Amino acid sequence: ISEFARTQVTRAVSEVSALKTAAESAILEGKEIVSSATPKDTQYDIGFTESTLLDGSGKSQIQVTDNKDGTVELVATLGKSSGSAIKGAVITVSRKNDGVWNCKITKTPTAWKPNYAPANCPKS
């Protein structure tokens, strides 16, 4: 892979962020949000495919926290084809109960550089 590290981080943020639509649909339907190949009963799977930039396999690349209170976290870790200077960093795309979302990056590796974070998902 020849993409820039910052392009990889941004793509990953976009891949997680693309799932907000589905999370909003689950919330309107009164269903628990999941990312699973085996959603149980009333659970609503958010339709994620797979990324070349995230650790884990398929739907398990996105870790969902659904507190059932209008807040949501969609969490992924940079891995696989990601450059060594970003691997292990965690993207968290979070919803407040007013329906406003935000993004942050945490747990970055030593070799992280400021310019790798996009303006829409700052390092915390």
Numbering used by the authors: 25 to 148
Passage from the reporting paper:
The type IV pilus is a diverse molecular machine capable of conferring a variety of functions and is produced by a wide range of bacterial species. The general architecture of the type IV pilin protein is an extended N-terminal α-helix connected by an α–β loop to a four- to seven-stranded β-sheet, termed the head domain, which packs onto one half of the α-helix. The C-terminal globular head domain faces the exterior of the assembled pilus, and in P. aeruginosa pilin proteins it features a conserved disulfide-bonded loop region that is responsible for cellular and surface adhesion termed the D-region.
The α–β loop immediately follows the amphipathic α1-C helix, and the receptor-binding D-region with the conserved disulfide bond to the last strand of the β-meander is present. The cacodylic acid also makes hydrogen bonds which stabilize the α–β loop and the α1-C helix as its O atoms hydrogen-bond to the side chain of Thr73 (2.46 Å) and water 17 (2.94 Å, B factor of 20.59 Å2), which connects to the helix through a hydrogen bond to the side chain of Glu39 (2.75 Å). The conserved disulfide bond is formed by Cys127 in the fourth β-sheet and Cys145; however, Cys127 is observed to have electron density representative of an unbonded cysteine (∼20% occupancy), which is likely to be due to radiation-induced breakage of the disulfide bond. Asn91 and Lys92 have particularly high B factors for this region (17.5 and 18.9 Å2, respectively), which is especially interesting as the residue which differs between P1 and 1244 is Lys92 (Gln in 1244), indicating that this flexible region may be of importance in the specificity and recognition of P. aeruginosa group Ia pili.
